[PDB]
Design a binder for these strands. Structure first.
Ligand SMILES: [Mg+2]
Ligand SMILES: [Mg+2]
Ligand SMILES: [Mg+2]
Ligand SMILES: [Mg+2]
Ligand SMILES: [Mg+2]
Ligand SMILES: [Mg+2]
Ligand SMILES: [Mg+2]
Ligand SMILES: [Mg+2]
Ligand SMILES: [Mg+2]
Ligand SMILES: [Mg+2]
Ligand SMILES: [Mg+2]
Ligand SMILES: [Mg+2]
Ligand SMILES: [Mg+2]
Ligand SMILES: [Mg+2]
Ligand SMILES: [Mg+2]
Ligand SMILES: [Mg+2]
Ligand SMILES: [Mg+2]
Ligand SMILES: [Mg+2]
Ligand SMILES: [Mg+2]
Ligand SMILES: [Mg+2]
Ligand SMILES: [Mg+2]
Ligand SMILES: [Mg+2]
Ligand SMILES: [Mg+2]
Ligand SMILES: [Mg+2]
Ligand SMILES: [Mg+2]
Ligand SMILES: [Mg+2]
Ligand SMILES: [Mg+2]
Ligand SMILES: [Mg+2]
Ligand SMILES: [Mg+2]
Ligand SMILES: [Mg+2]
Ligand SMILES: [Mg+2]
Ligand SMILES: [Mg+2]
Ligand SMILES: [Mg+2]
Ligand SMILES: [Mg+2]
Ligand SMILES: [Mg+2]
Ligand SMILES: [Mg+2]
Ligand SMILES: [Mg+2]
Ligand SMILES: [Mg+2]
Ligand SMILES: [Mg+2]
Ligand SMILES: [Mg+2]
Ligand SMILES: [Mg+2]
Ligand SMILES: [Mg+2]
Ligand SMILES: [Mg+2]
Ligand SMILES: [Mg+2]
Ligand SMILES: [Mg+2]
Ligand SMILES: [Mg+2]
Ligand SMILES: [Mg+2]
Ligand SMILES: [Mg+2]
Ligand SMILES: [Mg+2]
Ligand SMILES: [Mg+2]
Ligand SMILES: [Mg+2]
Ligand SMILES: [Mg+2]
Ligand SMILES: [Mg+2]
Ligand SMILES: [Mg+2]
Ligand SMILES: [Mg+2]
Ligand SMILES: [Mg+2]
Ligand SMILES: [Mg+2]
Ligand SMILES: [Mg+2]
Ligand SMILES: [Mg+2]
Ligand SMILES: [Mg+2]
Ligand SMILES: [Mg+2]
Ligand SMILES: [Mg+2]
Ligand SMILES: [Mg+2]
Ligand SMILES: [Mg+2]
Ligand SMILES: [Mg+2]
Ligand SMILES: [Mg+2]
Ligand SMILES: [Mg+2]
Ligand SMILES: [Mg+2]
Ligand SMILES: [Mg+2]
Ligand SMILES: [Mg+2]
Ligand SMILES: [Mg+2]
Ligand SMILES: [Mg+2]
Ligand SMILES: [Mg+2]
Ligand SMILES: [Mg+2]
Ligand SMILES: [Mg+2]
Ligand SMILES: [Mg+2]
Ligand SMILES: [Mg+2]
Ligand SMILES: [Mg+2]
Ligand SMILES: [Mg+2]
Ligand SMILES: [Mg+2]
Ligand SMILES: [Mg+2]
Ligand SMILES: [Mg+2]
Ligand SMILES: [Mg+2]
Ligand SMILES: [Mg+2]
Ligand SMILES: [Mg+2]
Ligand SMILES: [Mg+2]
Ligand SMILES: [Mg+2]
Ligand SMILES: [Mg+2]
Ligand SMILES: [Mg+2]
Ligand SMILES: [Mg+2]
Ligand SMILES: [Mg+2]
Ligand SMILES: [Mg+2]
Ligand SMILES: [Mg+2]
Ligand SMILES: [Mg+2]
Ligand SMILES: [Mg+2]
Ligand SMILES: [Mg+2]
Ligand SMILES: [Mg+2]
Ligand SMILES: [Mg+2]
Ligand SMILES: [Mg+2]
Ligand SMILES: [Mg+2]
Ligand SMILES: [Mg+2]
Ligand SMILES: [Mg+2]
Ligand SMILES: [Mg+2]
Ligand SMILES: [Mg+2]
Ligand SMILES: [Mg+2]
Ligand SMILES: [Mg+2]
Ligand SMILES: [Mg+2]
Ligand SMILES: [Mg+2]
Ligand SMILES: [Mg+2]
Ligand SMILES: [Mg+2]
Ligand SMILES: [Mg+2]
Ligand SMILES: [Mg+2]
Ligand SMILES: [Mg+2]
Ligand SMILES: [Mg+2]
Ligand SMILES: [Mg+2]
Ligand SMILES: [Mg+2]
Ligand SMILES: [Mg+2]
Ligand SMILES: [Mg+2]
Ligand SMILES: [Mg+2]
Ligand SMILES: [Mg+2]
Ligand SMILES: [Mg+2]
Ligand SMILES: [Mg+2]
Ligand SMILES: [Mg+2]
Ligand SMILES: [Mg+2]
Ligand SMILES: [Mg+2]
Ligand SMILES: [Mg+2]
Ligand SMILES: [Mg+2]
Ligand SMILES: [Mg+2]
Ligand SMILES: [Mg+2]
Ligand SMILES: [Mg+2]
Ligand SMILES: [Mg+2]
Ligand SMILES: [Mg+2]
Ligand SMILES: [Mg+2]
Ligand SMILES: [Mg+2]
Ligand SMILES: [Mg+2]
Ligand SMILES: [Mg+2]
Ligand SMILES: [Mg+2]
Ligand SMILES: [Mg+2]
Ligand SMILES: [Mg+2]
Ligand SMILES: [Mg+2]
Ligand SMILES: [Mg+2]
Ligand SMILES: [Mg+2]
Ligand SMILES: [Mg+2]
Ligand SMILES: [Mg+2]
Ligand SMILES: [Mg+2]
Ligand SMILES: [Mg+2]
Ligand SMILES: [Mg+2]
Ligand SMILES: [Mg+2]
Ligand SMILES: [Mg+2]
Ligand SMILES: [Mg+2]
Ligand SMILES: [Mg+2]
Ligand SMILES: [Mg+2]
Ligand SMILES: [Mg+2]
Ligand SMILES: [Mg+2]
Ligand SMILES: [Mg+2]
Ligand SMILES: [Mg+2]
Ligand SMILES: [Mg+2]
Ligand SMILES: [Mg+2]
Ligand SMILES: [Zn+2]
Lengths: 95, 107, 70, 97
RNA sequence: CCUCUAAGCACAACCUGCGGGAACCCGUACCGCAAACCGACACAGGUGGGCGGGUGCAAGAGCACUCAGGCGCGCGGGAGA
RNA sequence: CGAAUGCCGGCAUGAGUAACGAUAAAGAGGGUGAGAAUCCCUCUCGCCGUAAGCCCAAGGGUUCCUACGCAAUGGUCGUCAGCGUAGGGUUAGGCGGGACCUAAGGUGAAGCCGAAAGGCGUAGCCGAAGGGCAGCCGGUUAAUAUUCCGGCCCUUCCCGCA
RNA sequence: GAGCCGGUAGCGGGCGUGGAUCCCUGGAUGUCCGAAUGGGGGAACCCGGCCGGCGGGAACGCCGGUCACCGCGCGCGCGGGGGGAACCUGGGGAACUGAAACAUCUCAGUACCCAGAGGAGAGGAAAGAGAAAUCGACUCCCUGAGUAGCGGCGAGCGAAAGGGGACCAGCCUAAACCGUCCGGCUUGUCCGGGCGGGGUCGUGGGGCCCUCGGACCGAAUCCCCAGCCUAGCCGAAGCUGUUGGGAAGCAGCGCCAGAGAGGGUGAAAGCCCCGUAGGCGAAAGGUGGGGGGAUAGGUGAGGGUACCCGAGUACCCCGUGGUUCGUGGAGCCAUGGGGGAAUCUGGGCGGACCACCGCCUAAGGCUAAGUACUCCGGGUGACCGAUAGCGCACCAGUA
């Protein structure tokens, strides 16, 4: 069955992600078939918050090699939800 | 399907052949893929290791090497003699290893 | 997981109800996502816990399916 | 240049043979073939507009079985046929063949 | 978009004004007159659209000098047949 | 097998030979580094400027940013790079394309045609760099922004009131 | 039946006699594209209708279910669509070449294209063959035979009967006649369409009409089973000494053998390991051509009657195709065009035609095995052994 935990996968762990916590903007590794409307409900129904805005984008998989073979890391998608003024997703403030 | 092993870790075996032929001991491991076995104190070999946090001071470390299974032979705990493994059908009706020299069991 | 544990998880599940199975599942899939974020930061050393849930979550959805196929 | 809807006839293939000279039976050397080339023979198809169940039914049938159409018609009298549409009355007749 | 009526509907419906809420999928990096595109090459070739400043030369998207911006072209050093 | 301007491959000769891809051009200093004409900084000189500068679109597809590297690619050298490894980076209700429209053309209810395959065909559907539609300025990051932030505007749809 | 978390070690953590990994059969899940089918589409992308659920949910979005077209059958049901290495049948169908040029001819109805089918396909129960006064469906192999014949009688093409083998099997309908339901108008002894009965053959048979007589066959459909397939299991008999890195080598003494095929083990092992001869084995799917049982289905005789016995068909001519037959004396089989019958006193045939004598009984259909191929699995080679053998022994239809 599909649950908000199936939409949200892992957090974006970078200097750029972190720097969004102050403004309440939390970044995640979502599902490429996920949807801004689909994400929202997933964050809320999982982090007890009020999503006010969502910004998503696709991250294409990098091409890599074991010297002799060429492949590609999977393609990923990530969202950038804005939470109501004053709310916090603590598990990410972690940091 | 399965690799046929007449010996299992860790019953007592007789190094039938090889440089350590005649020596005896327990089977410290069983390698079906290469169809080999490691025996305690047998096939000893000196191997090198980097000056590494695990192996400070560098140096070498005596490893126990594997042997082809056809080289090892089990020792019946009864007659204490190395024997060929038959297989007995109890009334369980399980099958059990049993010495061929004497009807003893081997586990 | 351990077998005996597995067996129980089947006995216990097959005693349950689809709602109590969806609700149950819905939780362990939360229990995963918790673990996913831990490993994502390296603070997941018992990383075998993951595989269990998914295969717990799997064993659950199955028994859920056993019921509904009727 | 197609298929009889009643006889199943169909364009066959025939050769166009060209012969020269006097035959033997006419006290000659004999005929000689100067050029063979495939042709194709069509059934003499024609249209057959008939009205059945207050509905016009037309067949693309060969001139040979034309008198069979009316037979089908004549034979179709004993059928619930009103209310139907053209293609429906055709298929219902053909089923009689 | 405006307008005209037809069934239907005329407690609906549509127009205007205000109010709260709602507003999805893909693309967005970088090269792009070229070392990243077409030419087997980091190839003096070919490739659509826009901007393209200043002074002087009659004019100009010409010509020469120059701002911003960008370059000295991915082998050098000597020699003076 | 000794020959087929034979076939596959390996290695020689020409030979340290021509050449190293526009005659727009170079010089010194400082640093770096085992190692520098070839990388970074600085000053002087030269060169394009209806461009050899700045945007958009096709096409390429991670080549963009940063850290650590120089065996191989770079026509030399290389501590450099569009190269090797790893990590990070592309954020739209208003910019472009869709849930809007039609063009040539493509397909194609009805219907016509053909030995089979298939070929035609008003409507309708598909079809764009044409039509139509509501975002302008600035700041921010090493790397994205008419996309995030700020200020000031606007569009459409659902519900409710008048 | 003791190790496992694939090729794959390592970092980091687990599991297994409370029987794991692994192997075999059934089931569940099975995103997106693809016949692709809700609609579109530059395949794996994009946009909808309906019913139901989620979220604070009306707009927005996600989840489950359903919605393309065609045929057949009384809006709803069963079926079709596409793929498959060759093998098979049907609809079409060349050329180089050979003829030492070349057109008829050959290459050849082969290559190729298309539709279709299946584990096989086709063919198949005589309107046959053809001279035995005989044979007895069809298919395949041998033989008949490069015979008979065909042929710018050039190059070349090339049968059939009969005989010896493999396999073996025969059936259902249409029409006359009885009955029944429906619908047509031109009212019945009517015509027409369904269904059922009846009937299916060539010593001709069948119907109706009298008359005489009233159980043994048995499936190709269904059922049960053995048998087989897809994992497996038991499986006889050697130590020592010696050279050597290693024994399976040489020496000594023994043993098994329904097993001295082969492959491994540190080298050359009947008796060390995997195996070999000889035996065992299936809860579940599949198959089941052999065994047993059902069922649909099967069957008499003389006598008279002269209703039926498969239609634009047989038959004639015209244009072709197949057969060994290239217009030849040219029949037989098939049919595009024209004309156009009959129901046993019928009709087709026996190589133009006529007669005698004989064979057969068309214009509806079905039908096992023996036959063909080899993507697949297995056994085996006086087959190759990394320029060989498949194009690939290796991440190849890849760079
Ligand atoms: Mg699921
Ligand atoms: Mg930063
Ligand atoms: Mg909310
Ligand atoms: Mg986006
Ligand atoms: Mg996107
Ligand atoms: Mg790269
Ligand atoms: Mg000893
Ligand atoms: Mg043995
Ligand atoms: Mg399990
Ligand atoms: Mg003619
Ligand atoms: Mg004559
Ligand atoms: Mg002639
Ligand atoms: Mg007419
Ligand atoms: Mg006529
Ligand atoms: Mg007929
Ligand atoms: Mg009005
Ligand atoms: Mg009205
Ligand atoms: Mg009202
Ligand atoms: Mg408003
Ligand atoms: Mg959408
Ligand atoms: Mg560049
Ligand atoms: Mg540029
Ligand atoms: Mg630029
Ligand atoms: Mg230029
Ligand atoms: Mg330009
Ligand atoms: Mg130009
Ligand atoms: Mg080229
Ligand atoms: Mg290039
Ligand atoms: Mg160039
Ligand atoms: Mg040009
Ligand atoms: Mg001027
Ligand atoms: Mg001038
Ligand atoms: Mg000029
Ligand atoms: Mg100029
Ligand atoms: Mg000039
Ligand atoms: Mg130069
Ligand atoms: Mg230069
Ligand atoms: Mg140069
Ligand atoms: Mg020089
Ligand atoms: Mg000189
Ligand atoms: Mg020679
Ligand atoms: Mg030469
Ligand atoms: Mg040469
Ligand atoms: Mg020469
Ligand atoms: Mg060569
Ligand atoms: Mg010199
Ligand atoms: Mg010279
Ligand atoms: Mg010279
Ligand atoms: Mg030179
Ligand atoms: Mg100059
Ligand atoms: Mg310097
Ligand atoms: Mg210096
Ligand atoms: Mg240098
Ligand atoms: Mg250097
Ligand atoms: Mg230079
Ligand atoms: Mg200027
Ligand atoms: Mg592009
Ligand atoms: Mg490229
Ligand atoms: Mg880079
Ligand atoms: Mg280098
Ligand atoms: Mg180097
Ligand atoms: Mg270098
Ligand atoms: Mg190089
Ligand atoms: Mg170099
Ligand atoms: Mg070069
Ligand atoms: Mg260095
Ligand atoms: Mg650097
Ligand atoms: Mg760069
Ligand atoms: Mg790089
Ligand atoms: Mg390296
Ligand atoms: Mg970084
Ligand atoms: Mg915006
Ligand atoms: Mg738009
Ligand atoms: Mg929408
Ligand atoms: Mg349109
Ligand atoms: Mg068309
Ligand atoms: Mg049109
Ligand atoms: Mg539309
Ligand atoms: Mg447009
Ligand atoms: Mg436009
Ligand atoms: Mg607008
Ligand atoms: Mg716009
Ligand atoms: Mg404005
Ligand atoms: Mg950035
Ligand atoms: Mg009102
Ligand atoms: Mg692994
Ligand atoms: Mg470890
Ligand atoms: Mg999904
Ligand atoms: Mg579809
Ligand atoms: Mg479509
Ligand atoms: Mg709904
Ligand atoms: Mg949702
Ligand atoms: Mg849905
Ligand atoms: Mg098929
Ligand atoms: Mg054919
Ligand atoms: Mg042709
Ligand atoms: Mg020819
Ligand atoms: Mg030839
Ligand atoms: Mg010849
Ligand atoms: Mg030939
Ligand atoms: Mg010739
Ligand atoms: Mg010749
Ligand atoms: Mg010629
Ligand atoms: Mg031929
Ligand atoms: Mg054919
Ligand atoms: Mg097809
Ligand atoms: Mg097919
Ligand atoms: Mg068979
Ligand atoms: Mg058949
Ligand atoms: Mg018959
Ligand atoms: Mg003969
Ligand atoms: Mg002969
Ligand atoms: Mg002759
Ligand atoms: Mg021939
Ligand atoms: Mg015969
Ligand atoms: Mg015979
Ligand atoms: Mg046989
Ligand atoms: Mg028989
Ligand atoms: Mg009747
Ligand atoms: Mg009779
Ligand atoms: Mg039968
Ligand atoms: Mg054994
Ligand atoms: Mg020794
Ligand atoms: Mg010995
Ligand atoms: Mg042997
Ligand atoms: Mg043998
Ligand atoms: Mg051997
Ligand atoms: Mg030998
Ligand atoms: Mg041996
Ligand atoms: Mg046997
Ligand atoms: Mg058995
Ligand atoms: Mg009878
Ligand atoms: Mg009688
Ligand atoms: Mg009669
Ligand atoms: Mg002919
Ligand atoms: Mg003649
Ligand atoms: Mg003829
Ligand atoms: Mg004949
Ligand atoms: Mg005819
Ligand atoms: Mg007669
Ligand atoms: Mg007669
Ligand atoms: Mg005849
Ligand atoms: Mg005749
Ligand atoms: Mg005759
Ligand atoms: Mg005859
Ligand atoms: Mg005769
Ligand atoms: Mg006669
Ligand atoms: Mg006959
Ligand atoms: Mg007949
Ligand atoms: Mg048949
Ligand atoms: Mg068959
Ligand atoms: Mg057969
Ligand atoms: Mg094979
Ligand atoms: Mg060999
Ligand atoms: Mg050999
Ligand atoms: Mg090789
Ligand atoms: Mg090879
Ligand atoms: Mg070799
Ligand atoms: Zn014993």
């Amino acid at each position: 069955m599909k649950t908000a935990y199936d939409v949200i996968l892992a957090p974006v762990l970078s200097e750029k992600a972190y720097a969004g916590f102050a403004e309440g903007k939390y970044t995640f590794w979502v599902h490429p078939k996920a949807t801004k409307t689909e994400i929202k409900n997933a964050v809320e129904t999982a982090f007890k918050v009020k999503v006010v805005k969502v910004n998503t984008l696709h991250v294409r998989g990098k091409k890599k090699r074991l010297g002799r073979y060429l492949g590609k890391r999977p393609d990923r998608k990530k969202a950038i939800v804005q939470v109501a003024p004053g709310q916090k997703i603590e598990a990410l403030e972690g940091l | 399907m399965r690799v046929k092993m007449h010996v299992k870790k860790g019953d007592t075996v007789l190094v039938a052949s090889g440089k350590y032929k005649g020596r005896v001991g327990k089977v410290k491991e069983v390698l079906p893929k290469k169809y080999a076995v490691i025996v305690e104190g047998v096939n000893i070999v000196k191997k090198a290791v980097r000056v590494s946090p695990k192996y400070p001071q560098g140096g070498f470390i005596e490893k126990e090497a594997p042997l082809h299974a056809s080289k090892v032979r089990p020792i019946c705990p009864a007659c204490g003699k190395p024997t060929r493994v038959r297989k007995k059908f109890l009334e369980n009706g399980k099958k059990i290893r049993v010495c061929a020299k004497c009807g003893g069991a081997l586990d | 997981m351990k077998l005996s544990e597995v067996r129980k998880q089947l006995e216990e599940a097959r005693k349950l109800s689809p709602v109590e199975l969806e609700k149950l599942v819905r939780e362990k899939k939360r229990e995963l996502m918790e673990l996913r974020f831990q490993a994502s930061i390296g603070q997941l050393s018992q990383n075998h816990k993951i595989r269990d849930l998914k295969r717990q979550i799997a064993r659950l959805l199955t028994v859920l399916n056993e019921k509904r196929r009727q | 240049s197609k298929v009889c809807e009643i006889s199943g006839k169909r364009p066959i293939v025939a050769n166009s043979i060209q012969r020269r000279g006097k035959a033997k039976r006419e006290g000659g050397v004999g005929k000689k073939t100067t050029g063979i080339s495939k042709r194709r023979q069509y059934p003499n198809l024609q249209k057959v507009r008939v009205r059945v169940a207050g509905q016009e039914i037309t067949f693309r049938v060969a001139a040979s079985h034309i008198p069979k159409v009316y037979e089908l018609v004549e034979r179709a009298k004993g059928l619930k046929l009103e209310g139907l549409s053209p293609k429906e009355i055709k298929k219902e007749l053909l089923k009689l063949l």
